[PDB]
Amino acid sequence: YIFATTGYGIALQKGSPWKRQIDLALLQFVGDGEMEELETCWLTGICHNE
Amino acid sequence: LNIAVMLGHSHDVTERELRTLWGPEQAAGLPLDVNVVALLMNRTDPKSLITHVCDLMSGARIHGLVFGDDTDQEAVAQMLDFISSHTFVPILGIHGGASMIMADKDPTSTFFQFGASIQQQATVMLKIMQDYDWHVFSLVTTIFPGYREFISFVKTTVDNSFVGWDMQNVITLDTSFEDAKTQVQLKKIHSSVILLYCSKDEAVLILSEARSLGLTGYDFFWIVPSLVSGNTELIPKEFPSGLISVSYDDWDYSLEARVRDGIGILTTAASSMLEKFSYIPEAKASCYGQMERPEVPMHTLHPFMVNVTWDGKDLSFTEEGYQVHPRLVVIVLNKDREWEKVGKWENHTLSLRHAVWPRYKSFSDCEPDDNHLSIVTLEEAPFVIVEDIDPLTETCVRNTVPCRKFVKINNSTNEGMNVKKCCKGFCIDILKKLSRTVKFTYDLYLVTNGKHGKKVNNVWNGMIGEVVY
Amino acid sequence: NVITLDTSFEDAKTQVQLKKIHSSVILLYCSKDEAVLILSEARSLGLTGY
């Protein structure tokens, strides 16, 4: 129910030649799945009930 | 109807004349038989060649010209192209000075050499790299005639391929005799396989720089183009061994075979022209003069060089005069400085390899290394699986390790070709994980004697026996 | 590992020794006279980067 499901991203510079590499690296990491361990060992929501 | 051939002084005259006479008489009897006008003279000068052209023009209207050569000068090819352009007479390129092709064919010229363009050499090198599973590139070039378009072609070919080659940028040398910026340029090279687009004169200095910087190690590989390796008999002591190159030197086809192929192609073209149009071609008033306006009412022979087949071989030519199926034999510099054939390319434009990987060591210097170690594995457990490579110009798609397996041919013979195989499983993943920590090369083999085995007759078998021995 | 230079005025093995250097921070134990030549070799090989 988030009003604005935005994100964080990376703050680049106007005209900086990094939009052709940073986005590709992020997409590769998402596809290969290197964030599951990070989100499990850095978010670790304790309050879970079922 | 009238074909002339020019030969050097390498061999005798009467035997060459007899063979040229017997050539067209072997098979494919044309309705209009072609004669033979063969001359053997050591002299190679433009005035002599133009006088010979005039004489053969006066010689019962010779329609085709075949020129042999023994030197390595490229100016004779240029003058032959000029003569063809100003005479509209098809001339074929044979072994010798005209072997190397570097000038674009004139639209009004009719020339078809037996050589191959660098683009074909580029894709042959790419196929060799695919066979060797060398996915890392290092493109170092220099300012040379037409090398920029070669770089553009190789880039637009590697990026368009599904192999997924390395994205290493092109490190082009600025000018010769620097001694300061050359080391800076060589610093940026951090690859394992390096492709060279260089000249013969600059090859000595670049190899000396590589030897000084120690770039001739076991892990590093070198690729030499055809033009540098044109003089096979000329092997300087400063050239390290292992310089793999591709050419079509007289190792499997001789001058007689080349002239047989040329006369066969000419006869097929003449037969096709006669079938299309019933008109005997005629020359100009002079050899190549401009007394009258240059006009050719008859159609050019370029379209007739597409559907050409001789003795079941499609030895045709493209619009640029390049051979559709060139020889392109692969020559590797031996340890004792010799060139040997390790494959061919005529098999439907595919690549053939003798499957001999380790052929490089410390040639420039004296420092042995043990960076290449063989590994033996079995396929009896759900941890190692070997699969046939998919026939879609790809090396087991992705996440694979090259493998070797002795596939038995007959129930008696025990000869096994080194067929590349896939490598996947838990052990393969463990080895790949260890690779980063050990930065070591791998040579993966398979057990050729059943299962692992045990000590039989005080002799171990399988992987244990291979390790012991 | 320690990459020890053999002797001065080689011009051939010095580049081989410098090839093995693949680090970012380099410690030098050298003399004043040989410092000029080693720095010239580093400049030729471009080891004085940012």
Next chain:
Amino acid sequence: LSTMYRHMEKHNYESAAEAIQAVRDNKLHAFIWDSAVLEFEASQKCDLVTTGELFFRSGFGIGMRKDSPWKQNVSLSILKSHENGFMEDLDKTWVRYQEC
């Protein structure tokens, strides 16, 4: 998990409508597609159900050519629509419906 292609390639259909029709007709035991589409289909037709929590989570987007000068002017408009409550209203009017 490279063994999947030994079965996936031999059962590829032509369209999502054909795939869902086959699933409804008890042809395919399972189907793989985006979570939102499957959830909407399950909500609209109670004969289907969605299993699994999440895997390979991603997002949609709008694709333009690299030389198109309409990148920032479209991104700003999309963000304005997202922050002005248009996206939630569209989701309610096109995704949120009766739940089985």
Next chain:
Amino acid sequence: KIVNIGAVLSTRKHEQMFREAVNQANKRHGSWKIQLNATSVTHKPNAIQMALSVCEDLISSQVYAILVSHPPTPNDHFTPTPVSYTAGFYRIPVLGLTTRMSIYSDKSIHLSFLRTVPPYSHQSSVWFEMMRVYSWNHIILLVSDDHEGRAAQKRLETLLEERESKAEKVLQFDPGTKNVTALLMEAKELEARVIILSASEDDAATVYRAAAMLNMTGSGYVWLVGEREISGNALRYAPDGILGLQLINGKNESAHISDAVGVVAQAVHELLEKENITDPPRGCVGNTNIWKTGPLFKRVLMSSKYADGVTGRVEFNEDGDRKFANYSIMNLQNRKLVQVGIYNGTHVIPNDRKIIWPGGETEKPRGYQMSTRLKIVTIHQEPFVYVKPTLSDGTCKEEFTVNGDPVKKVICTGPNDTSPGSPRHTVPQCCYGFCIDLLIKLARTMNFTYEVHLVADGKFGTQERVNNSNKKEWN
């Protein structure tokens, strides 16, 4: 220290005047000792006789370079290929007068050819400089199927790729084809409004004739025309608004010959101090070898600098051609040529005269007209794209949501049947849903004209393997 320099010249008057010039130059500047005893030959129309005369009068006369000049008749070709080919046997350098064709630019065809006339690569560099100083983004290129055109296109691509810019569309012409209407309209249906031509005079005329037919000479269009494409009938067949080019002191045959001989008169001294010199044979018959000092001659010629030339300092590129040549922009005003843009090199020197443009505009058109015609492709997705057949009136039925609001609908275009191997018909469909709402929002906010289209195969499109699998093309 006696050397000779050959020269192929159109007329005997030029021969004698250049002989007098070289005789005077032998005593000018340093004038250490006897320098040059020049020999001149004429352009014989018969190729065989010309080649024999050149061999006899140059190879046997102890010469080191050949001064090949422009043919007397501009209409006729008289290609200088034979003399360069003959000089290539001994790596003999040759000095070109006004051979602007890019055939000799590549050293593969002619190993020894050092001309003082800049090739069309310099023209491409001038066009790139004009683009940089005028800030053009949407640029298309028209190149005919010729070697010089291909070389110019390659040079332009190499010079433009460094600024992460690539030509939107490149088309190929033929030497003789007249039905260029399809290519012209293909260029018209593009965002770029700048057209540049590079071909022969006849090809340029026959491709510019259709420009008036398709109203390509109107306002908002900029034409970049080369130096050789404005001459001839192009002046009569081209109205105002043509931005041509011209080389200052480029056609000055006497000045070019004087500069070349002044260069060689010192180059000979700069090369004669070597250990040995490979003298030519005493005749056209007897020697078949090759000089070993050819690269040395090429290096000493290219590395030498001469500020005494009319155009200034004389330097050679990697191809041994003119570098930083003086270019003059010609503007066709009232069917007359006016010199406005004069460029020494790597520097802009604007003039007070106004630069007119086609269509009568007094200001530079930006050439950025997207026309808001953004083609839209939509994939049939059930939760997001509801596709229904249309009625006989061309409009689908109108329904309402749960809240009674009018549901927007967009006319859809696509195949009638998605089954493969069927007679596909592009009947009008009617697709509506989630994406069309945001599309309409974008259209009403930033002035977009959307036209949704379907996909015949019904696939998003990824890399696929087909016949000739080396071609990785997205489907």
